[PDB]
Amino acid sequence: GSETDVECFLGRAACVHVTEIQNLFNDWKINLSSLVQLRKKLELFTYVRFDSEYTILATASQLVVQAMYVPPGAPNPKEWDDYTWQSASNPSVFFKVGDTSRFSVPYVGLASAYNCNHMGSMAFRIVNEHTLVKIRVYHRAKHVEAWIPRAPRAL
Amino acid sequence: GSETDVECFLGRAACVHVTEIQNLFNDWKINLSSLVQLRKKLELFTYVRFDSEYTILATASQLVVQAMYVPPGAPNPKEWDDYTWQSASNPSVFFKVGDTSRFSVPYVGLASAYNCNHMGSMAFRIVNEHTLVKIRVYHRAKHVEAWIPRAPRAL
Amino acid sequence: GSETDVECFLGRAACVHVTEIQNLFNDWKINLSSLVQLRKKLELFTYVRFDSEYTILATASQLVVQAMYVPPGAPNPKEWDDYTWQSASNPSVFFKVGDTSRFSVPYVGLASAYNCNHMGSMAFRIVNEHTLVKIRVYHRAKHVEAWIPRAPRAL
Amino acid sequence: VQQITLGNSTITTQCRFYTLDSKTWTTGSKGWCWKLPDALKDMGVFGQNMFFHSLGRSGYTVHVQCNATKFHSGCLLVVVIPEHQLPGERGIDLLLGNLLIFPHQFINLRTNNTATIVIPYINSVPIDSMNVSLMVIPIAPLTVSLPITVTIAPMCTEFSGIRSKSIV
Amino acid sequence: PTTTLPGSGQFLTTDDRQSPSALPNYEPTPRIHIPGKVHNLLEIIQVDTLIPMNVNSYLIPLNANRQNEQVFGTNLFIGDGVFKTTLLGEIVQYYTHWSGSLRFSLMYTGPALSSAKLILAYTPPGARGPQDRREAMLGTHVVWDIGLQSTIVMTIPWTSAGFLSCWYQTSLILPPQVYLLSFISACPDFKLRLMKD
Amino acid sequence: PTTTLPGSGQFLTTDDRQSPSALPNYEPTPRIHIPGKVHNLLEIIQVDTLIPMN
Amino acid sequence: PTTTLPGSGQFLTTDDRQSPSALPNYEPTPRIHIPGKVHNLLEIIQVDTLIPMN
Structure with a gap:
């Protein structure tokens, strides 16, 4: 029964953002609500603390x-x-x-x-001065604490 | 007499599947019955547990x-x-x-x-977007346990 | 309150000098007064000792x-x-x-x-004999000691 | 026993009692919704402290009682949702199966006519500018209308020390 | 003196490892006591939730002048069917092997003077559902007088799915349609083994 | 401070080594008592079998 | 026998680490007692300064 623990259920590396740079830059405001497979599991708790x-x-x-x-x-x-x-x-x-x-x-x-x-x-950014690079960032929630279970979203 | 132990007899790395990808994908359902040199040694036991x-x-x-x-x-x-x-x-x-x-x-x-x-x-798959790669997977059975010796297959 | 310590306030890696060599050489006399974001924080102390x-x-x-x-x-x-x-x-x-x-x-x-x-x-220099290389040096002050707080510079 | 008196107020059921307007549960009503402390923003002395002090912190005890005879049928689900998402003392006159995860107490006219919920202060900060929403949903329809009375008692309430601090 | 072995510089998504902080020497916003801390997911699937068996799809309809007939009948496959949207079946959707006992409960909502005897029959896994009150009464079952008890709580045996049905033993004695509400949850012996996406 | 010696990043099929799990934090189907456990291959070659002599 | 994990040979500006000296075996100019040593920045923001109010 270690797989029902909230560090096992929510604390696993998923692909949160995928972008492409040229030799110019891309900035992503961190929002784990962009990935609907991580948001569907995280939005059944009101409050959550994690590194x-x-x-x-x-x-x-x-x-x-x-x-x-x-x-x-x-x-x-x-x-x-x-x-x-x-x-x-x-x-x-x-x-x-x-x-x-x-x-x-x-x-x-x-x-x-x-x-x-x-x-x-x-x-x-890519630092070289005077090719297309694909960036995939994988986020893993660490030392998670949850506190009010909500009804799961259906729509 | 360490070579007659079932971790020595069955627990060694052999080439179980060989495929080729392009720059698209290949999936192999794991079946150690595909390699007849490992199946001939493994099908003389009814049940076997191994990582x-x-x-x-x-x-x-x-x-x-x-x-x-x-x-x-x-x-x-x-x-x-x-x-x-x-x-x-x-x-x-x-x-x-x-x-x-x-x-x-x-x-x-x-x-x-x-x-x-x-x-x-x-x-x-190969992740790069917009060459032929040969994939060889070698499987090694670990912490093996066998339990009913059968007659060896002749045909 | 660890971020108000002078090893936390002044002891962090910033880009102090950026040059470009060819395949000939460049020498920079070390002066942390060239970077106005590190000089503005360092010139509020008269004397400072750091490795x-x-x-x-x-x-x-x-x-x-x-x-x-x-x-x-x-x-x-x-x-x-x-x-x-x-x-x-x-x-x-x-x-x-x-x-x-x-x-x-x-x-x-x-x-x-x-x-x-x-x-x-x-x-x-680049050692190869008979391409443009961009050099970025990052300096980090270590074991810092400060001793007379001055008025911060406005101009 | 059956006469809980709190401050200048007295109630009969089985820090003061604020009784919101009595709603009429007709057979076609979907239910009601009251955000707290917004349902008490106009409620005498609490509404004054809530407006006067910039930050506050309060718990609540909600008694929902439906005065009726022993001849009526149907059941209401009284549920308090912390931090509900997309009114005053008049409320909001209106998946559902999963709402039982939130603190709830079904009233069923066959057996019961009262529900009492003690709500603690729930927030991601210890003190805040004045958060939870009480909903009353008729699940099994009413077969013979019936009055619904909501009574909120704010308890263990504290407010900010500013505007009362001396500068010396 | 060291030698790099096979699988060096590989990136396994499931490899939990320590890592350097981007911004060290930072004291983050302190921890306060928020009530209802969820330590394990196995403790929130244990709460009763309504079953969308039939607002109108949670109400099991009961009607007068019907005897020896069936009120409802369902499979107990927690993965699909009526259980899919319940909290139990919406969290069993994240795991391949769900194995354990369940808590099935009912509540009558009609007037206090109304009465009937309803039989709640359990058919174990592997067998065929009943097509008569006699078949249902002969197997596992609880005779439930609605007038006497408003609520009946069953506890389904250990499973790893069976059928469950309700039949009118006596017609509804309405005073001069009414509804049953069904609820589902899992007992503390319910496990959840392998993760899914 | 370390130095990589000859034969680094080589793949020997007979080199038995520990490795990270693909799916950690999983309790696999428990072990039951099946009779006739074969501990060594030298104990099943010891049983009489017929010789196809004719 | 070791295996290099993800994020090897990366350069994090905030990663405080030990390093070899360019010129080892050098005794640097001794430390003297200068008065008013500032140990924390939180102790110099505590002194009164005029407010440019008008």
Whole structure:
């Protein structure tokens, strides 16, 4: 009966966002409501507290990738020569195209749990100057706590 | 006399399935009866319980590979743009072409041992969008238990 | 309240210098006053003592990189066939283009702290003989000690 | 026993009692819905404290009683939903099977005519600007109309210290 | 001195591993005591929910001047049919092998002077459903006087699905249509084994 | 601080090694007592069988 | 015998790690007692400053 635990039921890696960059940039505001197979299981609880593990996979077709996390309440990049990319406050990871990176954002919220809520945003660029890269981000909820079971949505 | 033990006699890595993908997909329902050199040694016992270790080798000729395991009773992928590939419930491994991946499925059955029986299926695709890759899967039976010796098959 | 500590406030990796080499060389005298987002936070203290960690990222566009550190009071390279590059006294790191190197210079000064001061210089070349490489150096202040808070600069 | 008195109020059933307007359960009515504390925004001294103080925190005890004879048929489902999604003291005159997951107490005229629900303060923050919604749904239709009375008692209520703080 | 073995740099979605934080040295919004914490999913499938057996599709219709006839009859396959939308059958949809005992309950909603005797018969898995009151009464069953008891709670035996039906032993004695409400949940011995999408 | 020695990333079919599970946190169908468990192959070659001599 | 997991050779700007020195075996200019050492930023925001109100 370990598969009925909420870390087993909700805490598994699914593909939350898929984008494509060129050699310019793409920013995704983090919202786990975009994937209807994870939202259908998560919206049967009112409040939920969980840390996170993002595993980013980059694949090319016809190089370095700068996947930068942006904390809640901080501006997103608007171009591919912006100052947000060079900014020290916002974390970033530089990994080669074809393999995968992995990081782990802590529970970032204002209330003691998310109510299905500002998780932040991830911005993606390729650093080389003067090919189409497909980015797949897989999110895994960690140390989950749920608190009011709701009726499951039918429509 | 360690070579007469059933972990030594049956528990060794052999090539169980060989397929070829293009840049679209191939699914193999797991059946160790396809390899007549492993079936001839395994069909002298009625019942057998064993975990498994799958070592997948991918080689190219003229890239990333998504070898997804599918638990017993779950649907298989039908195209190369299906929703089964993005589904969180079914495990998957993403490895580069030319090297090898390795995972270990537990004893997946309904009865306490297989009677020589739903082991599941593996589906293979190459993730790059817009070369022929040869996939060789090697299976090794682990923690084997046998229970009724039969007469060996002659025909 | 760990984010108000001076190792948390000042001790984080920012992009201090960005240059481009050809297959000839570039030398940068180390000055953290070049980055106005790190200088605005560091020039509210008179004196500051800190070791350093330099993480150099090299990316190509159309190879080995010799990023050599130069201790305070030692001559800088003037060409790409100079004798300073072969000199044993000055440290150097040889890493492939596309990944990153990392080293850690100790507190190099004449007074017991820097007053916002000879930190030295880094020289960059590509070793191959007979492509444009972009070099980004990220500096992180380590074991920081501050000592006289000043009024913050407005202009 | 059967005369719970709370503050300046007294009720007979089996911190003050606010009795909302009595609704008439006709055979074709779908039910009713009351968001809390919005149903009490105009309710005397509570409505004054709720408006005056910027932040607050309160629990509730809801008694729903349907005065009727021992000849009527039908059953109502009284359910309190925390954080319900898409009115005043007049309520909102209106899958269902799954609503039993939420705290509920079926009233069935055959057997019962009262339902009492003690609601604690449920929120993702310890204190908040003044959250839950009570619904009354007639499931089995009424066969012989019948009056429905809703009584809310806010209890264990605290409000913010600002506007009462000295600066010295 | 180390050697990299097969399966290095592979990405298994189900491989639970530690990882470096993007923003370390951050104290996140403190934890407060919210009531009703759900520790296991097996504790919320245990609550009774209505069965959409027939608002009108949850009301099992009872009518006067009918004796030896059938009120309702259903299969107990929790995966499909009437149970699909119930909380139990909407969470058994996320698992391949559901194995355990259930709690089936009923409530009468007609006037207090009305009375009838209804027999609630259970047919075990593998057998054929009854087509007569005698067949139903001969097998497992509970004779239930509606006037005497408003609510009857059955507990289906261990299963891994069987049939369940209700028959009029006596006609409804209406005073000078009425309804039954059916509820379903699972006993604490109910397991849930393999995950699905 | 480590150095990769010769024969790294090689795949030997006879190299018995531990590996990560595809589906962790799964309790598989329990083990029951089936009689006649064969522990070694050397114990079933010891039973008499007819010789096809003629 | 080891296996490299996902996120190997990645460069996280916020990952605080030990590193080899460029010039080891060097004793740097000694530490002297300068008064008014700022240990935390939360102790200098506590001093009164004028408000540019008008």
